[PDB]
Amino acid sequence: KPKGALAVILVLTLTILVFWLGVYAVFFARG
C-alpha cells in the first residue's frame, strides 16, 4: 500500500474540497 502517496492525495482532496465549497458558499451569499 503506497500509504505516503495516499496522505498527500488526501491533503490535496481536502484542499480542493475546502476551496470549492468555500467559494460556492460565497457565490450563494452574493447571489
Binding site: 500500500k1 503506497p2 502517496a5 482532496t13 457565490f27 452574493r30 447571489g31
Partner: protein
C-alpha cells in the same frame, strides 16, 4: 520488492483516478444546478449586440444618464450603464430593492470591469458590444462598482455607485 511495490501503487492510483473523476463530475452537477436558478442571471446573455463606441455618448440610450433606468416590466428595470475612462454613468445608479435589474453595459473607449462589490455581478465591458447581465438586489443601501480590468493610469480610481432604495 519492486514488482510488488509497482503493482500496489498502480492498484491505488486507479482508485484515486476514479475518485478524482467522481469529484470533478460532482462539481459539474453542482455548477449545472447554479445554471438553473436566479443566481445565474449574472452570466452574460451571450447575444452579440453591436454599437458604435464613437457615437454612444451622443445618440441613443447611453447619452442621457438620468433617463438610463427604464421600467421594462411590472417588476423589472433595465439600466443603460456607460463604463468609460474613468467612471460610470449614471452616478449613482438608482434602483428599487427586490426588482429585477437588467444591466446593459458598454464602453466608449477601452475595456473596463463592472464588478459590484457585495454581489456576483462581475462582467467585462468591451467597446462596441453591449454586456447584458441580471440581478435582483435583496438588501437596500450602497454598493460600490469597481473596475477590475486595467484600463490605463486612472484604473485604481475608477469607481461607481449603485443605490438600492428601500
Amino acid at each position: 520488492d519492486e514488482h510488488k511495490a509497482h503493482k500496489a501503487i498502480l492498484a491505488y492510483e486507479k482508485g484515486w483516478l476514479a475518485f478524482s473523476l467522481a469529484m470533478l463530475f460532482v462539481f459539474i452537477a453542482l455548477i449545472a444546478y447554479t445554471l438553473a436558478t436566479h443566481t445565474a442571471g449574472v452570466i452574460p446573455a451571450g447575444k452579440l449586440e453591436r454599437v458604435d463606441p464613437t457615437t454612444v455618448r451622443q445618440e441613443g440610450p447611453w447619452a442621457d444618464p438620468a433617463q438610463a433606468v427604464v421600467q421594462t416590466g411590472p417588476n423589472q428595470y433595465t439600466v443603460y450603464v456607460l463604463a468609460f475612462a474613468f467612471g460610470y454613468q449614471p452616478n449613482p445608479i438608482e434602483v428599487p430593492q427586490g426588482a429585477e435589474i437588467v444591466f446593459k453595459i458598454t464602453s466608449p473607449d477601452v475595456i473596463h470591469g463592472f464588478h459590484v462589490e457585495g454581489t456576483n455581478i462581475n462582467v467585462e465591458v468591451l467597446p462596441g458590444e453591449v454586456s447584458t447581465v441580471r440581478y435582483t438586489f435583496k438588501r437596500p443601501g450602497e454598493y460600490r462598482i469597481i473596475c477590475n480590468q486595467y484600463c490605463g493610469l486612472g484604473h485604481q480610481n475608477m469607481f461607481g455607485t449603485i443605490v438600492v432604495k428601500e
